[PDB]
Amino acid sequence: WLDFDQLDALKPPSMYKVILVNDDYTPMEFVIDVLQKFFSYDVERATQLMLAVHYQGKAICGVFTAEVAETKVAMVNKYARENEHPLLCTLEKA
Amino acid sequence: MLNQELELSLNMAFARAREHRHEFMTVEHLLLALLSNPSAREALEACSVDLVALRQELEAFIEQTTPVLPASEEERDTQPTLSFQRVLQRAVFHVQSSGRNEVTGANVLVAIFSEQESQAAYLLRKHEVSRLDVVNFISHGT
Ligand SMILES: [Zn+2]
């Protein structure tokens, strides 16, 4: 459960790409874990995206609202930190 | 302290989100809940806001953009977005910075405006409501 105490032209907010960046220490298995856990990919697609991260240096995990993207990025980076991997997750305007 | 009516609004918003299996409770779930929160509703009525249209816009945006948790996962449940957390913290900060303690749905409404990349802030400004409009209502009524 949650503790709520303690936890002129006008354009709509833009959507954001959530990206996973490559590094030399994070195991392929962990990248796949992250893709399945935080992005709901199946083993097949998660594996393809992990290879893209590995060979292209970066890969787009998904496109979300600014608000959702920011949260997913923090959750992934916190998970990588807890598992002691330097897996970097970022975002940028779609 | 978040007042009783605000706590009721927050807890029911969170429960609705959990029942729909949303991965996140957003600032839009928050604004949708504030439409039936007396304090925030009064403020919006004083600003001549079409509450039926705003309700529909929020509901459409929520179901179309909020990711849903897989039917096969009980390790992780509905979580507030960072943006949602910031709004509550800001509402408390604003009230405390005035030397008071009671936080109402209207104070939370004021705090939403500071999440500039949120759809909720966009929709409020689309409905001709400014942060100052709400603060003036809180301080001086209609
Ligand atoms: Zn829903």
In B1-142 the beta strands, taken as DSSP E runs, fall at: 24-25, 79-80
| Gapped junctions in chain A, after residues (C–N > 2.5 Å) | 7
Element (H, E) at B6: helix B4-19
> What span, in angstroms and rounded, lies between the C-alpha atoms of B53 and B129?
14
Domain extent at residue A56: 1-94
A89 close to A20: Cβ distance less than 8 angstroms: yes
Q: How far is A11 from chain B (nearest CA, A)?
A: 8
CB contact under 8 A, A13 and B117: yes
Q: How far is the CA of A48 from the centre of ligand 1 (A)?
A: 31
Q: Of the candidates B1, B14, B81, which has its C-beta nearest A67's C-beta?
A: B81
Size of interface A-B (CB pairs under 8 A): 60
What is the residue-wise DSSP string for B35-73? TTSHHHHHHHHHTT--HHHHHHHHHHHHHHHS-B--SS-
A23 close to A88: Cβ distance less than 8 angstroms: yes
Give the CATH number, domain containing residue A51: 3.30.1390.10
> What span, in angstroms and rounded, lies between the C-alpha atoms of B142 and B139?
10
How would you classify residue A85: left for phi > 0, otherwise alpha for psi between -120 and 50, otherwise beta? Answer: beta
Structure tokens that stand for B3 in this block: 């007042």
Altogether, the residues listed in chain A come to a count of: 94
Strands of the sheet with A58-65, listed across from one edge:
A58-65, A15-21, A88-93
CB contact under 8 A, A7 and B85: yes
> What span, in angstroms and rounded, lies between the C-alpha atoms of B29 and B13?
6
b/e B63-97 (16+ beta carbons within 10 angstroms → b):
eebbbebeeeeeeeebbbbbbbbbbbebbbebbee
State the resolution, in angstroms. 2.2
Q: How far is the CA of A35 from the centre of ligand 1 (A)?
A: 24
Per the listing, tokens 């392929």 go with A28
> What span, in angstroms and rounded, lies between the C-alpha atoms of B17 and B78?
7
SS3 B98: coil
Q: Which residue of B has its CA nearest to A64?
A: B65
Q: How far is the CA of B11 from the centre of ligand 1 (A)?
A: 14
Domain total in chain A: 1
Per the listing, tokens 């509550």 go with B88
> What span, in angstroms and rounded, lies between the C-alpha atoms of A60 and A90?
10
Task: Look up residue B17 and give its amino acid.
Answer: A
Which residues, listed in sequence order, are joined to residue A91 by a DSSP beta bridge?
Answer: A18
- DSSP alpha helices (H): ranges in chain A? 28-39, 43-56, 66-82
Set out the domains of chain B in order of their start, with CATH numbers.
1-142 (1.10.1780.10)
